[PDB]
C-alpha cells in the first residue's frame, strides 16, 4: 500500500531524529561508565535500546508504505559533564516531543490513522519515560546538590 | 442494633477525617514520586492504603450500628516541599490522635466497648506507626541535613 | 513540561469527579454488604479500586504537566435501596462518560495527544465495563423481577 | 473423485443452511450476553462453534467430490426476547433435522455411503444435542415460569 | 489468684448463658438439616462451636480465679419455623450482648482487666458476627420474600 | 447508551464486510488444503478466525450502543487458482482498509471515540498483518516464480 | 592513560565505519523482511547486533585512552535487490577488513598491543563470519540460480 508522500517524508524526518537519539545515548551511556557512574550507564544504555526500537518501528512502517528509509542520523550534541549531558538529552527529547506531536497532526489530516498510533506510542514514551526521567534527575541535583546526586549514581 | 446517636455522630466525624488523611497521603505520595523520591512515594502510598482501611473500619461500624455514613472528606492541606509535607502530615496525625483519644473516652461513657476497641487499634497505628515515622524523618533531617536526607530517599 | 492551562484545568475537573466516583462506590459497596448481598459488595468494591486507579492516572498526569492537583471530591449522591443505588451509579457513569468525551475533544484541539489517550482508556472502561454492567443489572430486574434479582446477589 | 451431481447439489443446500445456523447462534449468543445471561451466551457460543464445524465438514466433502461450495448463508430469523430466540433456534434445528434426514436418503439412493455417514453424525448432533437442549429450556420455562428460568441463566 | 467474688459470680451468669446459646444452636442447626436447608445447618453448627469456645473461655477463667463453675445451662427457647428460629436466636444474642456489656463495666469497676478483655472479645463476636448475621437473614427475607430466601439456603 | 444512528449504521456496514471476509477465507483455506498446500491452509484458517473476532467486536459494540446487528454477509468473490485467490483476498483487504479509515473519520466527527479505537485496532490488523502478508506472497511469486512459490507452501 | 593520538584518530575512523556497517545491516535486514525473506532478515539482524558490539568495543577503548569518540556514521550504500544488497554488504566488509588490518599494523608500530588485540578479534569476525557468509550466499546463487536461492530464504 502506497503511503501519502507527505506522511512518508515526515516519518523519514522522525527516523533520522531517532537514529540520532540512539547515538547520543550510545555515547553518553559509555561516558557515564568511563567515569564510574554505573547507574547512569544502565539507564542510558536502556534508553539507547528504546530509541533503537523507536527507529525500527518507523523504518518498518516506511517500508510497509512503500517508501525508502533515510538512514543518515541527525547531528548529535553530547555534553562534557553530567549536568550538561542530562540537559543535552532533555533538549533532544523536547525536540522529539514537538516533532512527534506535529507528526500526529499531519497523520490525522492525511487519514493515516495507523501511522498516527505508532507516533502516539512513541510520544507517550518520550513524555512520560524519557523526558520525565531527565527532568527528575535535574530536579534531584537542584534539591540535594550535584555531589550528593553523583554519589547516588555510582 | 442501633448505636447511641452521640457515638454514631462521633464515628462520622472520625470517618471524614480518615477519608481526608487517605487523600492527603494520595497527593503527597504522588508528589514525592514526581520529584524522584521513590522511598517516600512507597511509604506514603502504603499510609494511604492504611487510612483507607481505617476509614473502611469506621464506615462498616457506622452501618452495623444503623447509622448513615458521612462521606465528605475534611479539607486537606498539602505542603509544597519535602519538609512542609512531612510537617503537614505530622500535624494531621496529631489531630487524628487527639480525636481518637476523645472518641475512646466517649465510647467508654456510652458503654460501646466494641467501637472503643476499633478506635484503640487505630490510635495505636496513629501513634506508633504513622506519627512516629514522621517524627523520625524530621529528626533525621535535623541530624544529617536535608540534602543528605533527600539523597537517602531516592 | 508545562501542559496547556486549559487541559490541566479540565484534567482537574475529571480528577475531582473520579475521586467522587471512588467514594460513591465505597459507600454503596459497604451498604450492599450490610444487607447481605455479597456479590454486589464484590463488584462495587472492585469498581472503587478501578476509580481509584482512574483518579491516580489523572493525578500523575497533572503533576507531570507541572499542574497542581485538585483533591476535593465532587459531591456524591448515594441511593437508599438496591434499585436507587444502581440508578444513582449509572447516572454518575453517564456524567463521567460525557465529561471524558468532552475532554478528549479538548485535548485534540490543544494537541495534547498523550492526555487524550489517557482519557480514551478511561472512556472505554466507563462505557464498556462500568456503565454497561449497571444497565445490565437494571435490565435483569426488569426481566425477572427485583426479588429474584436480589436472590441472585446473595 | 467426482461426486454425483445430485449429492453435491444437496450437500451445498445443507452447507448454506449450516452457515446460517452458525450466524443465528452468533447473534443470539451475543444478545444473551448483552442482557447479562452468561449461561445462555456460553451455550449458544458453543453451538455456533459446532455449526461452524458442521459447515466445515460439508465444505470439505464437497471439495473432495470435486464440487464448488456455495458460501452464501441462508437468511436467518433472530427473536427479540429469550422465549422467541429459543423458539426460533428450535424451528431452525427442526428444519435442519428434516433436511439432513432427506439427504441421508438421497445419499443411500446414489450409493454415496461416506457422505451418508457424514450427514448421520450431524443428524445425531442436531436431534440429541441441539434440538433436545432447546426443547428442555422451553420445558423448564413452562415448569418454573420465565422469571425463575431467566434467574437461573445469569 | 482469687478473683473478686462479684466478678466470679457474674462470669458464672455469663457461662450458663453461653452453654444455653450453644444448645439452642445445637437444636436449631439440626432442625434446619432435618428440613433440607444445609446452608443454615452449616452456619448454626459453626455458631454452636463458637459458643462452646465462648463457654470454655469463661469456664477456664473462673477456675483460674479459684471459683467454681456453674454448669447448668439457662433455659432455651427454640422456634418452630425458619423465621421464628432466626428471631429466637437474635433475641438470645441481644440478651448476651447486654449481659456482656454489663460485665465489662463490672470488671472495670473491680479492676479485673483481663476478665474485661475476655468479655470484650466475646462482645465483638456477638455484635459483629452472630447478631449481625441474624439481622441480615431477616433483612433478606424482607427484601426477596421468605420462599426465595429459603430456596437460597438449600 | 444509545449510539449515534450514523455510527451504528456504519458499524453495521463494516460488520457485514467482516462476516464476508471470514467466509472468503473459509472457502480459500479449505481450497488450499484440497490442493495439498497446508501452509496456505494454516495461514488463511488463522485469518478466518481473526475476521471472526473482528466481526464479533463490531457486533458487540453495536449491541452495547443499542443497535440491531445486520448479519447478512456481503457477497464474496473466491479465485480459482493460487494467484487469483491471493489477489482476490488482497482486493478485499484493501476495500476493508478504506472502509475502516472512513469509519474512523466518521466516529471522530460524531465524538464516538471508543468506536473509533475499535476500528483503529482493526485497521492496524488489516494493513500490517492481513494485507501486508498477501502483498508479500505475490512479491515472492514475482521473485522466484510461481512453481517455486507453490513448492514452498506444501 | 592517554593513548597515542595517531592510534586514537585511527580507532575513531574504524568507529565511524562500524556505526555505518550497523546501519547498513539495519536497513538491509528490514528490507529482506519487507519482501518476506525471513532467513535473510534473521542473519542480517544478527549482523547489525554484532557491528553494534564492534562499535561499542572501539568506543569504550577510545574513552579509556582519554580520547573523544566520533559518532557520525560513514555514508551507507544499500542495494535495491537481493544480489545488489549481498554485494553491497560484501564490498563494505572488504573495506572494513582492509581498514582493520591497517589498524593492527599501526597499533604494533605505536606499541599499543591491547588496541591491536581488540582489532584482531574484529578482523577474525569480519573475515571468517561476516565476509565469508556473504561470499557463500553469492556462491549459492551462482550454483543453483537466484530463484532457488530466494526460495531457500523464505
Ligand atoms: Fe524516541
Ligand atoms: Fe526519546
Ligand atoms: Fe522503559
Ligand atoms: Fe487513621
Ligand atoms: Fe494516620
Ligand atoms: Fe504498616
Ligand atoms: Fe472512572
Ligand atoms: Fe466509572
Ligand atoms: Fe474490571
Ligand atoms: Fe448443524
Ligand atoms: Fe444444529
Ligand atoms: Fe457439544
Ligand atoms: Fe457467645
Ligand atoms: Fe453468640
Ligand atoms: Fe466465625
Ligand atoms: Fe477484518
Ligand atoms: Fe482482514
Ligand atoms: Fe495474527
Ligand atoms: Fe565490524
Ligand atoms: Fe562486519
Ligand atoms: Fe555470530
Ligand atoms: Na427464585
Question: If you had to describe this structure to a student in words, what would you say it looks like?
Answer:
The structure is cut from a larger assembly and holds 7 copies of chain A (154 residues). With 154 residues, the first copy, chain A, is mostly helical. The first copy, chain A, has a single domain, classed as Ferritin, core subunit, four-helix bundle (Ferritin), CATH 1.20.1260.10. In chain A, 81% of the residues lie in helices and 0% in strands. Chain A has 5 helices and no strands. Chain A has helices at 5-34, 38-64, 82-109, 113-144, 146-152. In chain A, 45% of the residues are buried. Chain A binds chain G through residues 19, 23-24, 26-27, 30-31, 33-34, 55-56, 59-60, 63-64, 69, 71-73, 75-76, 78, and chain G through 19, 23-24, 26-27, 30-31, 33-34, 55-56, 59-60, 63-64, 69, 71-73, 75-76, 78. One fe (iii) ion (FE) is lined by residues 21, 51, 93, 96, 126, 130 of chain F.
CATH fold annotation of chain A: Ferritin
The secondary-structure element order of chain A is: HHHHH
Number of strands of chain A: 0
**Interface with most residues:** A-G, 22 and 22 residues
Which percent band covers the strand fraction of chain A?
under 5%
Secondary structure tally, helices of chain A:
5
Summing up helix and strand content along with how strands pair, one would put the structural category of chain A as: mainly alpha
CATH class of chain A: Mainly Alpha
Shape of chain A from CA axes?
elongated
Number of domains of chain A: 1
Helix content of chain A: over 70%
Radius of gyration of chain A: 17 Å
Binding site for Fe(3+) D (chains A, B, C, D, E, F, G): 47, 50, 129
InterPro entries (chains A, B, C, D, E, F, G): Bacterioferritin, Ferritin-like, Ferritin-like_diiron, Ferritin-like_SF, Ferritin_DPS_dom
GO molecular function (chains A, B, C, D, E, F, G): ferric iron binding; ferroxidase activity; heme binding; iron ion binding; iron ion sequestering activity
Binding site for Fe(3+) E (chains A, B, C, D, E, F, G): 50, 129
